Design a protein around this ligand. Structure first.
Ligand SMILES: N[C@@H](CCC(=O)N[C@@H](CS)C(=O)NCC(=O)O)C(=O)O
Ligand SMILES: N[C@@H](CCC(=O)N[C@@H](CS)C(=O)NCC(=O)O)C(=O)O
Ligand SMILES: O=C(O)c1cnn(-c2ccccc2)c1
Lengths: 198, 198
């Protein structure tokens, strides 16, 4: 299929899709737009938000809905319907927490205060929950990698930008990040992707 | 299997699961807890959030992850891979908006304010987008009902509690709510369920 992904020049909410494409060896156009081209693009979109994925000219929206769509019938989805449930649940848990951050806050001091509060209190709580959920296991769900591990690596990469020592007391979570980053298709992508803060 | 759903005594985030069980004619224990007993149960949960669904000897969490699990390979899931993606995307659009509400805000003044803001300034745009998306079609996705229609009915029911005039300019969305409420299994559940505000 002819795939075209549209998003800003950042990892952000498109990165999970980009990892999936890379892992499944699926070719696509990684279209990154600058702010100036957004108003026009936005007006053509039923829900006015990005990312969107065009598949043979048909437009899909909602980054996680798209991620799930791409992993369907693949092992990245989870090995059973039950494992698929756990995968979806971990992804949602990570997404809920990332959504707490005031990414668009215009008052820089307020943004700093809120980030510090979330990173001092909430983040370590979630990390303890995540660490104990993973236990001494290889991957978050089942015995092979799933897109939940990808989303963990993606979300943690962004959290580490703001609190580099966040995982200093969670070696098991660091090891999970390293395992995901070491998958050849992922390692290749991380090397060649545009370097951005977010 | 044996199913035990645990949540507060309200529709809230458990309601989508309750509609799915109703539609699929699956018996389950509808366990509703008092807030006073929450902290105790919360401490034993891997991620400390409800609803949870106990199936056999495992706990499942994240309402939409559970809904996705229960609807998989049923007539409530989309009819094609792409339709499944649109079902997931519409659910996520509605969830993204419902998640903006400070449901747990302790300060009544602050809570009322944000609620009023979201309902007055944001909600009408979502309605515009959904109305255009539905167009003149019978259901949100495809030719038959999906759990996205259920979620629309559920979310709109709560929004209407706070803003009764929300759909005065959207007769097609009022018609959709009515169609969902007319589905026999749904109608029966709406008639018999505990009547709560949220
Ligand atoms: N949960 C949705 C969020 C989509 C969304 O809010 N996208 C943002 C960028 S991260 C956007 O298009 N905002 C610009 C705008 O709304 O004008 C998803 O994951 O796709
Ligand atoms: N995204 C989650 C939200 C879970 C959630 O925030 N549930 C609330 C009640 S609706 C809760 O357990 N809050 C009590 C607490 O966290 O202390 C889902 O869909 O299940
Ligand atoms: O947490 C709550 O009190 C609450 C009430 N309604 N909802 C909700 C959230 C999302 C979708 C439907 C209902 C949450």
């Amino acid at each position: 299929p002819n795939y075209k992904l549209t998003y800003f020049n950042m990892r952000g909410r498109a990165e999970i899709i980009r990892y999936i494409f890379a892992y499944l060896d699926i070719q696509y156009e990684d279209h990154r737009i600058e702010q100036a081209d957004w108003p026009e693009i936005k007006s053509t979109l039923p829900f006015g938000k990005i990312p969107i994925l065009e598949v043979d000219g048909l437009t899909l929206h909602q980054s996680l809905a798209i991620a799930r769509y791409l992993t369907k019938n693949t092992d990245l989805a989870g090995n059973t319907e039950m494992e698929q449930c756990h995968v979806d649940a971990i992804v949602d848990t990570l997404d809920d927490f990332m959504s707490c951050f005031p990414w668009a806050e215009k008052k820089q001091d307020v943004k700093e205060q809120m980030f510090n509060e979330l990173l001092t209190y909430n983040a370590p709580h979630l990390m303890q929950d995540l660490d104990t959920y993973l236990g001494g296991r290889e991957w978050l769900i089942g015995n092979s990698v799933t897109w939940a591990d990808f989303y963990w690596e993606i979300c943690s990469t962004t959290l580490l930008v703001f609190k580099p020592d966040l995982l200093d007391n969670h070696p098991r979570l660091v090891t999970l990040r390293k395992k995901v980053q070491a998958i050849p298709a992922v390692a290749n992508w991380i090397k060649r992707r545009p370097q951005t803060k977010l």
